[PDB]
Design an enzyme around this catalytic site. Structure first.
Site, mmCIF file in Angstrom:
data_model
loop_
_atom_site.group_PDB
_atom_site.id
_atom_site.type_symbol
_atom_site.label_atom_id
_atom_site.label_comp_id
_atom_site.label_asym_id
_atom_site.label_seq_id
_atom_site.Cartn_x
_atom_site.Cartn_y
_atom_site.Cartn_z
ATOM 1 N N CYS A 156 0.823 -0.880 -0.014
ATOM 2 C CA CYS A 156 -0.362 -0.141 0.155
ATOM 3 C C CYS A 156 0.818 1.220 -0.429
ATOM 4 C CB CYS A 156 -1.018 -0.350 1.241
ATOM 5 S SG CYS A 156 -0.126 0.414 2.909
ATOM 6 N N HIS A 195 -0.855 11.448 16.105
ATOM 7 C CA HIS A 195 -2.042 10.885 15.254
ATOM 8 C C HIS A 195 -0.902 9.620 14.635
ATOM 9 C CE1 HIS A 195 -3.321 9.870 11.076
ATOM 10 N NE2 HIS A 195 -2.293 10.621 10.634
ATOM 11 N N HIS A 223 -3.884 5.410 10.016
ATOM 12 C CA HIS A 223 -5.402 4.298 10.046
ATOM 13 C C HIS A 223 -5.310 2.961 10.164
ATOM 14 C CE1 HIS A 223 -6.046 8.225 8.641
ATOM 15 N NE2 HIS A 223 -7.561 8.486 9.093
ATOM 16 N N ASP A 255 -8.553 -4.452 5.556
ATOM 17 C CA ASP A 255 -8.205 -5.344 4.254
ATOM 18 C C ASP A 255 -7.497 -6.101 4.595
ATOM 19 O OD1 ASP A 255 -6.721 -3.382 4.106
ATOM 20 O OD2 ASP A 255 -7.358 -2.645 1.963
ATOM 21 N N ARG A 283 -5.264 -4.112 8.493
ATOM 22 C CA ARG A 283 -4.317 -3.355 8.393
ATOM 23 C C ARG A 283 -4.096 -2.039 8.540
ATOM 24 N NH1 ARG A 283 -3.834 0.839 3.048
ATOM 25 N NH2 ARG A 283 -6.028 -0.389 3.471
ATOM 26 N N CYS A 307 -1.749 1.309 9.308
ATOM 27 C CA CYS A 307 -1.390 2.023 7.898
ATOM 28 C C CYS A 307 -0.446 2.848 8.685
ATOM 29 C CB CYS A 307 -2.190 2.085 6.835
ATOM 30 S SG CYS A 307 -1.348 2.535 5.388
#
Ligand SMILES: [Zn+2]
Ligand SMILES: [Zn+2]
Lengths: 131, 131
Positions: free
Chosen positions: B64, B101, B104, B108, B117, B119
């Site tokens: 990704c 932060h 996310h 998937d 996942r 990410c």
């Protein structure tokens, strides 16, 4: 685009950020680019092909998070294309010599000048100082 | 969040990318992060507070464009929050100790594991090798 594309050479010469921005239309995050707040006299060149694109005299404080200019050096150095990516409709700006993705142009620029905000990734440019 | 907030100190210590990602929920462009492809054994810590967040053993090649893990070290180290920004509905992942932060989490991921996942921006992390 006149400047010939040589991917092997670009991948060798460009940083990952420069490559992704210019070749894959990535966007540097706001407030992270090298030239966001630069005020030095000089010329900003295409990082890919070296074409002069923007003059320091056209750079202004926009607060948007990227280098922002109210006009390019001339009407020939930039190519514009509609962009429908990322759930938005915008006008992409590219280098007219080599096709490099530079950023976007918006109609919220200086009303006392051109009304245009050329919002350009730092990673798409290289600055030539002229003191 | 328990870890005490000093913006001034962060601005000095963090690179602009690390600062904007962790403090202003910026997102590093895909295929630009330092740790995207990293396979070395070790621990990924929060760049802000140093908390251990993810283990190399939970890292996998998602393709990704960012570091991706199928689970954090434990459930306690991450906070999740719905994110309605950028014209999407997603699940933000933050550091539970300092609120940074991180990225996310998506559904998937590997179905032979959590199906998740995580990410994560490379710029939210610092790798500690445990070779
Ligand atoms: Zn060019
Ligand atoms: Zn933290």
């Amino acid at each position: 685009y006149p400047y010939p594309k040589d991917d092997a050479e670009l991948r060798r010469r460009l940083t990952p950020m420069q490559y992704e921005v210019t070749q894959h239309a990535a966007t540097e995050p706001p407030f992270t680019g090298e030239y966001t707040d630069t005020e030095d006299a000089g010329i900003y060149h295409c990082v890919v092909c070296g074409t002069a694109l923007f003059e320091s005299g056209a750079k202004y404080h926009s607060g948007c998070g990227w280098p922002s200019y109210f006009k390019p050096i001339d009407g020939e150095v930039i190519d514009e294309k509609m962009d429908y990516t990322h759930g938005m409709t915008r006008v992409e700006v590219r280098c007219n010599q080599c096709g490099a993705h530079l950023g976007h142009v918006f109609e919220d620029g200086p009303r006392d000048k051109t009304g245009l905000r050329y919002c350009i990734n730092s990673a798409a440019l290289n600055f030539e100082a002229k003191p």
